[PDB]
Amino acid sequence: GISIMIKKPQKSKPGVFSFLDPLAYEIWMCIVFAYIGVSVVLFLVSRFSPNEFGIFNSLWFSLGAFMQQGCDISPRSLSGRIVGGVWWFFTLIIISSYTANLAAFLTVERMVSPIESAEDLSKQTEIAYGTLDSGSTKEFFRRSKIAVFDKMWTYMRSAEPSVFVRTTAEGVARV
Amino acid sequence: TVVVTTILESPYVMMKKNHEMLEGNERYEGYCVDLAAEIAKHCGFKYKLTIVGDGKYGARDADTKIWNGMVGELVYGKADIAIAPLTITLVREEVIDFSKPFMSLGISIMIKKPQKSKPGVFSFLDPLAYEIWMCIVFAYIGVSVVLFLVSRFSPNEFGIFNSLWFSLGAFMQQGCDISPRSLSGRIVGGVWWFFTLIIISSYTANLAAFLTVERMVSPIESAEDLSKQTEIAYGTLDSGSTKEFFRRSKIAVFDKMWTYMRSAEPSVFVRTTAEGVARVRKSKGKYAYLLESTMNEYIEQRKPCDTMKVGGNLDSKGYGIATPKGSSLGTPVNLAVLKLSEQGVLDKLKNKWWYDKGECGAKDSGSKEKTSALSLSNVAGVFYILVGGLGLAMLVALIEFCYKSRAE
Amino acid sequence: RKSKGKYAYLLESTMNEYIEQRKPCDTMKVGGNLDSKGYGIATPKGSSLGTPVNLAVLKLSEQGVLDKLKNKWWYDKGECGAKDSGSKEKTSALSLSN
Amino acid sequence: YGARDADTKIWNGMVGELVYGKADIAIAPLTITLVREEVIDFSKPFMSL
Amino acid sequence: SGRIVGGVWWFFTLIIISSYTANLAAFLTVERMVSPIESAEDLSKQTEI
Amino acid sequence: SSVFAVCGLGLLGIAVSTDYWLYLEEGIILPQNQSTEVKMSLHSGLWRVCFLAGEERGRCFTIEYVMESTVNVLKMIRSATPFPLVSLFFMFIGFILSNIGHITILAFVSGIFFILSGLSLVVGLVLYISSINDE
Ligand SMILES: N[C@@H](CCC(=O)O)C(=O)O
Numbered sequence: 034g035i036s037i038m039i040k041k042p043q044k045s046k047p048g049v050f051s052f053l054d055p056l057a058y059e060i061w062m063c064i065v066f067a068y069i070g071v072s073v074v075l076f077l078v079s080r081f082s083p084n085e086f087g088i089f090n091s092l093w094f095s096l097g098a099f100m101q102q103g104c105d106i107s108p109r110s111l112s113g114r115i116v117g118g119v120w121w122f123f124t125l126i127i128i129s130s131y132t133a134n135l136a137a138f139l140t141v142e143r144m145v146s147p148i149e150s151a152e153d154l155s156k157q158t159e160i161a162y163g164t165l166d167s168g169s170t171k172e173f174f175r176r177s178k179i180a181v182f183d184k185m186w187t188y189m190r191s192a193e194p195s196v197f198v199r200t201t202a203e204g205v206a207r208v
Numbered sequence: 209t210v211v212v213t214t215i216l217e218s219p220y221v222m223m224k225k226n227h228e229m230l231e232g233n234e235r236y237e238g239y240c241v242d243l244a245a246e247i248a249k250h251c252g253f254k255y256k257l258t259i260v261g262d263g264k265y266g267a268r269d270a271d272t273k274i275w276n277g278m279v280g281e282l283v284y285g286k287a288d289i290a291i292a293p294l295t296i297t298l299v300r301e302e303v304i305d306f307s308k309p310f311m312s313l314g315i316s317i318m319i320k321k322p323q324k325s326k327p328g329v330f331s332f333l334d335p336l337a338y339e340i341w342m343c344i345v346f347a348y349i350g351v352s353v354v355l356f357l358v359s360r361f362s363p364n365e366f367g368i369f370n371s372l373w374f375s376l377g378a379f380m381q382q383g384c385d386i387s388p389r390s391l392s393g394r395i396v397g398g399v400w401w402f403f404t405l406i407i408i409s410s411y412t413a414n415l416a417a418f419l420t421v422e423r424m425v426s427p428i429e430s431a432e433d434l435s436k437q438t439e440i441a442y443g444t445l446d447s448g449s450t451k452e453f454f455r456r457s458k459i460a461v462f463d464k465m466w467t468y469m470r471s472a473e474p475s476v477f478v479r480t481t482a483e484g485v486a487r488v489r490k491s492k493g494k495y496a497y498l499l500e501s502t503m504n505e506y507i508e509q510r511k512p513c514d515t516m517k518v519g520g521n522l523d524s525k526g527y528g529i530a531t532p533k534g535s536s537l538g539t540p541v542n543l544a545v546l547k548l549s550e551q552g553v554l555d556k557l558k559n560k561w562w563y564d565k566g567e568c569g570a571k572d573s574g575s576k577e578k579t580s581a582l583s584l585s586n587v588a589g590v591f592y593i594l595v596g597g598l599g600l601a602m603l604v605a606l607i608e609f610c611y612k613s614r615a616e
Numbered sequence: 617r618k619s620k621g622k623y624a625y626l627l628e629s630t631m632n633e634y635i636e637q638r639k640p641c642d643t644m645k646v647g648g649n650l651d652s653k654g655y656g657i658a659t660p661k662g663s664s665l666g667t668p669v670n671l672a673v674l675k676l677s678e679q680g681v682l683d684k685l686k687n688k689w690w691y692d693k694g695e696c697g698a699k700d701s702g703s704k705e706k707t708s709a710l711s712l713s714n
Numbered sequence: 715y716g717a718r719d720a721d722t723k724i725w726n727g728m729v730g731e732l733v734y735g736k737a738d739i740a741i742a743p744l745t746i747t748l749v750r751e752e753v754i755d756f757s758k759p760f761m762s763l
Numbered sequence: 764s765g766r767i768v769g770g771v772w773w774f775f776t777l778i779i780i781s782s783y784t785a786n787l788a789a790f791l792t793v794e795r796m797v798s799p800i801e802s803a804e805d806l807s808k809q810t811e812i
Numbered sequence: 813s814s815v816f817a818v819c820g821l822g823l824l825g826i827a828v829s830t831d832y833w834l835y836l837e838e839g840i841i842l843p844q845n846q847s848t849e850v851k852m853s854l855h856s857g858l859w860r861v862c863f864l865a866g867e868e869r870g871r872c873f874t875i876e877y878v879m880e881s882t883v884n885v886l887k888m889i890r891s892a893t894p895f896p897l898v899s900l901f902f903m904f905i906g907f908i909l910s911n912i913g914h915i916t917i918l919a920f921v922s923g924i925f926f927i928l929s930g931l932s933l934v935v936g937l938v939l940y941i942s943s944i945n946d947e
């Protein structure tokens with residue numbers, strides 16, 4: 034029977050920092066610039082105001098509030114509870130944006146169907162489907178009229194460049 | 209076997225570059241050049257492929273009354289058969305005895321393909337509408353008041369200022385070290401905790417829907433509000449049919465459309481059906497080239513895949529073979545076309561020439577999705593609220609310290 | 617109307633634009649025109665009535681009367697409310713209703 | 715509106731009121747098509763469909 | 764004895780809320796896929812209607 | 813605390829002066845993967861923007877005109893231009909008022925102007941990146 038031969042889908046090595054793919058590298062450098070930028074401001078806004086916040090316990094608040102755990106102190110002033118206010122809203126939108134796109138990288142590449150039939154390869158004009166020249170297979174698509182094969186011969190005849198290879202060993206190498 | 213007064217075009221007649229090698233009938237080819245063959249079955253008469261060097265499709269010209277281009281070749285006895293795209297106007301009927309139409313077109317719209325929009329600063333709160341983000345803030349205060357009233361006039365570190373920190377402590381899910389202690393203060397802290405579980409799991413859930421299946425909008429669809437909501441440049445072709453239909457506008461919704469083209473600048477018209485594509489193609493902001501329908505579904509199909517036809521068929525005008533007013537070959541011509549149409553040989557050539565090239569549309573938009581990572585421009589408004597929140601915070605730090613300094 | 621989104625009805629566009637402008641507005645013209653044809657005032661084959669009426673519709677065109685009649689019975693018939701007009705956003709955020 | 719059937723049963727419908735000689739001039743929403751071209755006569759298309 | 768009751772209930776509330784956030788992001792992105800019929804050839808394939 | 817102020821002026825000072833903020837490699841592709849050579853590759857800055865591959869000529873222009881995507885970015889860099897300038901303003905104010913404090917509130921009020929410069933520079937880098945991903 035005439036059959037299809039494509040490249041096998043070996044997947045990849047993902048590259049071992051692929052977990053921070055759903056946010057681009059401009060976000061992961063602007064979180065850290067805004068993690069220092071909030072932790073310094075929390076230090077100053079509760080220093081010359083009425084103690085328990087150094088710079089060091091302020092880094093532990095901001096890192097605590099960003100991974101959504103419950104770092105233990107609290108801000109205590111209306112000057113101080115705003116820095117802990119907007120940073121809590123910052124870490125709500127970023128983590129919800131991370132969980133969204135990682136549930137959008139996966140359910141998009143789960144939609145991705147490999148070609149599994151001839152009529153599927155009829156529509157998928159991405160892959161170029163060239164058969165052997167001067168053989169029985171070229172005769173089959175040219176003559177027959179199953180009308181899935183009429184469209185397949187149509188795109189195969191309008192080759193760009195010549196999809197008819199000339200021989201089987203060259204055809205395996207062309208895939 | 210006389211004169212084919214056609215014009216170099218999209219797939220009806222053009223000079224293909226194989227005439228740099230070949231000759232004969234194959235110098236000029238296309239859809240209607242095939243139609244030349246199956247009209248020759250009945251009339252018997254051959255071709256003479258003469259692309260009009262004057263080709264500016266036109267009519268009799270304004271106040272000079274000289275016929276332009278194709279009818280400049282057709283009417284004056286320089287041509288007799290006119291197998292080509294030629295649109296039957298009633299003022300052209302006053303000049304030309306026609307045949308019956310091949311197909312029929314309408315005045316169409318070539319808008320550019322919707323490329324993804326630029327998200328604004330506040331696009332992060334797209335997945336939850338602007339009624340909910342106002343219902344939350346008043347339910348924030350509306351719950352933070354009820355913690356206050358319950359924990360005060362009952363047996364207390366819950367002031368107002370410590371109760372706007374519990375409720376904000378629970379909506380960002382960062383928790384609490386205050387933790388109310390009655391029964392009537394735990395029910396407020398209870399049902400507010402169930403409020404934040406559903407809203408955050410509806411924000412994350414809807415944002416996972418906007419970033420997976422991205423339906424898009426063509427905002428200049430349905431040409432009546434193309435005319436009414438004037439936003440974009442009403443571009444079109446030049447001397448020929450499409451202006452003369454809108455010059456004679458008596459339907460007022462097309463007339464106010466024409467007045468906006470009458471008050472247009474600098475592109476009231478330009479030229480060149482190929483170039484009119486390109487003026488959409490490279491400007492991409494507002495140019496909305498208003499060409500004939502059957503040319504529009506060709507360019508949309510070919511393979512740039514970068515334009516798209518919004519709206520449909522603002523008129524109904526026909527392609528018929530033109531004959532210069534009496535023109536004895538006419539009766540072999542029109543009865544042939546009828547036998548081409550009723551048998552469907554003209555429809556067979558419709559089936560051929562509009563499925564020749566690389567097919568596009570939603571056909572190319574199959575399983576081809578790769579979806580990108582978020583750029584900074586999707587969450588950039590949160591960095592403005594974050595830094596701008598600190599500018600408010602360092603401001604109150606001075607105000608609090610000055611109200612302790614001027615206390616002294 | 618009774619199939620509740622299960623039955624499509626292929627009809628002409630000149631009838632279709634009126635039907636979606638009647639007070640139970642729950643129909644809509646889906647796509648573009650599948651072809652193009654034309655309405656015509658008919659005479660029997662080889663009639664004396666042909667060319668007076670044929671010269672009428674030519675005259676009726678540039679006077680602007682027939683396309684005024686195109687308005688006259690169709691322009692005011694947005695008495696349904698035209699709820700399609702205030703719905704072109706097709707917004708996709710959750711609302712309060714969710 | 716109009717039709718054509720098994721033998722002809724001549725042109726069932728409003729065109730049957732116009733092909734049999736039942737009536738003259740037929741101001742109506744009748745559609746112009748090629749089948750109706752050969753049997754009876756028409757005006758110019760006054761609308762667009 | 765006490766930190767196990769707070770242990771397995773913390774694992775119970777991790778799987779339930781992650782199951783709630785999953786399907787609410789599966790009710791939405793499924794009914795966002797749902798395309799109304801917009802052309803003739805779309806209605807050719809959609810044999811439901 | 814003096815040295816971090818001394819090192820702070822020069823580092824942003826080099827950055828606001830130099831012409832190597834942003835690169836570009838606008839090219840083409842061919843089948844057999846046959847990518848490109850250089851086709852259009854401009855490096856860029858904040859005030860002098862210097863083409864490198866499309867013409868090879870360093871038209872390092874005080875941006876008001878030409879010498880298509882390029883000047884469009886430079887209109888968006890124009891939208892993000894003053895924020896490193898404000899951060900350079902508040903740094904030098906925080907620099908001099910720190911040295912006066914060494915020679916009270918005079919040292920502490922300078923520490924406000926370092927953080928106001930830093931928060932100006934975060935909105936500086938964000939709006940600069942938000943302008944690029946716009947284009
Ligand atoms: N064995 C085959 C080779 C050519 C083909 O695969 O069509 C033949 O002789 O026909």
Ligand SMILES: N[C@@H](CCC(=O)O)C(=O)O
Pocket residue numbers: 265266293294295445446447448449450451500
């Ligand atoms: N068929 C048209 C082409 C030019 C135009 O669309 O205006 C004509 O002959 O006038």
